[PDB]
């Protein structure tokens, strides 16, 4: 079969939100790493 | 990207040395271009003025001065008499602070060592000989320095150990040879080190159908064996007893003095400096009455 477009919108909304939430905690991880020992 | 090959044994035995042509040209150029030029000699008369000269008693004043210029070039940089001396008083063996000029103390021992190498180990160094440059390369530290580590370190073949043989000189097993296969592994590890130290392979010194054979081996194997006897003398009598002389930054973790090995002279080449012949130009270092028939210019 396949993915129906209203399911694809629901899935995309989660997938984009999850991706950005991961990037946000990785941003804080780099904020902490930089203030402990900057690499430039 | 071509390979140079040198045949060192009979047809079809594959006793051959292989070299990457680009790599070898590079290593060779990086010796020739830095190879230090020697100042020319002289022959003045008269009695010697020195206050605290103990090894170089036997050469003219001009030869002595020329030697000191060479030593600084070969160990310290071309003008760096301050590396060994209180420049206000060359005869000093101490700083103005009273603390000993350890580099001058070492260099005096290194002169005796070099004369011992060139004089007593001519079976190894022949008429090429060694000078301070052979090990030092213009720098205070030679390559291949080694220290006490574990009991089974094979570099102690060059210090206190003797005996590497493991092969039986007969068909049947006997009580004469009880060597372990582990001992053959130890000799094999030792022999890889020697091969690498010269940039050669096993066939330079062996026909590997019988590693024990001397008749089937190139004559270089006999020279190599005298190199082992020479290093034992150099390490036991000259380098290892300098333990109280150096600052603790030069010493090993056990507090032992730095010791030499084949790579210290050879630096990965089949002869040191690809066989450059410098010792003939510096009679201060010969330890011989004549160098290749050229007589020693005594006083």
């Amino acid at each position: 079969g396949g993915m129906t477009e209203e399911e694809a919108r629901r899935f995309h909304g989660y997938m984009v939100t999850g991706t950005l939430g991961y990037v946000v905690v990785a941003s804080v991880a780099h904020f902490l790493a930089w203030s402990w020992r900057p690499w430039f | 990207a071509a390979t140079d090959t040198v045949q060192v044994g009979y047809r079809g035995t594959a006793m051959e040395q292989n070299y990457d042509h680009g790599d070898l040209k590079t290593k060779f150029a990086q010796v020739k271009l830095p190879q230090s030029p020697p100042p020319a000699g002289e022959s003045p008369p008269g009695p010697l003025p020195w206050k605290n000269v103990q090894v170089l008693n036997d050469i003219s004043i001009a030869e002595f001065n020329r030697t000191m210029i060479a030593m600084s070039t070969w160990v310290a940089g071309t003008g760096n008499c301050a590396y060994c001396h209180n420049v206000a008083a060359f005869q000093d063996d101490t700083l103005p602070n009273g603390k000993p000029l350890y580099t001058k103390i070492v260099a005096r021992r290194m002169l005796q060592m070099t004369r011992n190498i060139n004089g007593n180990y001519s079976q190894h160094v022949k008429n090429t000989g060694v000078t301070c440059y052979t090990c030092h390369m213009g720098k205070p530290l030679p390559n291949g320095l080694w220290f006490y580590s574990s009991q089974t370190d094979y570099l102690r073949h060059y210090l206190d150990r003797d005996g590497a043989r493991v092969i039986t000189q007969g068909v049947a097993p006997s009580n004469a040879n009880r060597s372990s296969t582990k001992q053959a592994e130890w000799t094999y590890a030792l022999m890889i080190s020697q091969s690498r130290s010269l940039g050669v392979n096993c066939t330079y010194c062996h026909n590997t159908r019988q590693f024990a054979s001397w008749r089937e081996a190139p004559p270089a194997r006999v020279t190599a064996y005298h190199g082992i006897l020479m290093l034992r003398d150099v390490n036991q009598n000259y380098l290892a007893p300098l333990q109280p002389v150096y600052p603790a930054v030069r010493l090993g973790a056990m507090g032992d003095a730095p010791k030499a090995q084949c790579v210290t002279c050879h630096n990965g080449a089949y002869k040191p400096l690809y066989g450059a012949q410098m010792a003939k130009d510096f009679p201060a270092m010969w330890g011989r009455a004549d160098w290749n028939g050229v007589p020693f210019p005594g006083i």
Partner: protein, 315 residues
């Protein structure tokens, strides 16, 4: 190709039959009591080896992977002879060797029982017995020379270090005639399987790969196989007997090998000198000549013990 059949109920009367061929259960991969014990004993052998290797890099899991092919579980020191050694100095080695040996023998029993249950000839366990024979000479030859130090270290590059040093210690294994024979059968095994594999694929169009039918009811595929080799090299096997040539060439590889190892260090200590005695060694012109003083000067010492002190040279 690319018209595969797929069978939903059980072939043997994709999928597989659960059932019996008389005493033989079909379905699961057969272990039985001997197979289960073999896996238990062999697992403990593998664990002892790996834990010793991992301990030798100080438990560092990065170095354990990075250095893995250089890591060894190493046999005892030579001066113990056949006595029990300290646990850290070969005691774990002998323990892993014991469990590995039991595990191998239990696997042989597992294979032997399965062949009989399937009502098959005993050819496979006797072929495997030839491999086990060679393996066991890495125990019996160290036993016959009198020291467990001569055993093979467990480790990828370390066991190859041993293989080279064994040939060095005993004066070049190329001149061992049973090593030479073992190589002839090893190469012959590659010659035969190349020839036979190519032969059967060359007649597979005619049903030649159905070898049991071709043995019991000779088809044109068998006849063409026989005529190819007869016309090529003047003699031929049969569809059955080519498998006997195959069987013996494989089996003789490890059998002649094992005899060569057992003879080494027990009967002959220098195979090159045995080669000289028996006329194997081709002459070359001398590369060097020693004077009588050099013959005394250039003899060395046999290798001794390592120095157990750190001398000072205080002078």
């Amino acid at each position: 190709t690319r018209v595969q059949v797929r069978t939903v109920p059980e072939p043997g009367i994709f999928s597989y039959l659960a059932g019996k061929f008389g005493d033989a259960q079909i379905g699961p991969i057969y272990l039985g009591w001997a197979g289960v014990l073999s896996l238990i004993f062999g697992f403990i052998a593998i664990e002892i080896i790996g834990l010793n290797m991992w301990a030798s890099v100080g438990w560092d899991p990065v170095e354990f992977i990075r250095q893995l092919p250089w890591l060894a579980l190493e046999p005892p020191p030579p001066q113990y002879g056949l006595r029990v050694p300290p646990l850290n100095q070969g005691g774990w080695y002998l323990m892993a060797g014991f469990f590995l040996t039991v595990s191998i023998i239990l696997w042989w029993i597992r294979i032997y029982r399965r062949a009989r249950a399937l009502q098959m000839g005993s050819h496979l366990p006797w072929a495997f017995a030839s491999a086990i024979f060679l393996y066991s000479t890495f125990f019996f030859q160290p036993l016959l020379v009198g020291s467990w130090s001569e055993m093979v270290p467990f480790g990828i590059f370390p066991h190859l270090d041993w293989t080279s040093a064994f040939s060095i210690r005993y004066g070049n294994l190329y001149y061992n005639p049973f090593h030479a024979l073992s190589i002839a059968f090893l190469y012959g095994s590659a010659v035969l399987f190349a020839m036979h594999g190519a032969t059967i694929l060359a007649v597979a169009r005619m049903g030649g790969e159905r070898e049991i039918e071709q043995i019991t009811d000779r088809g044109t595929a068998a006849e063409r196989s026989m005529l190819f080799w007869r016309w090529c090299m003047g003699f031929n096997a049969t569809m059955e007997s080519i498998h006997r040539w195959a069987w013996w060439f494989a089996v003789l590889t490890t059998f002649t090998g094992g005899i060569g190892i057992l003879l080494t260090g027990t009967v002959v200590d220098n195979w090159y000198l045995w080669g000289v005695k028996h006329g194997l060694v081709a002459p070359y012109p001398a590369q060097n000549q020693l004077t009588p003083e050099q013959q005394d000067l250039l003899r060395g010492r046999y290798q001794g013990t390592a120095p157990d002190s750190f001398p000072s040279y205080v002078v």
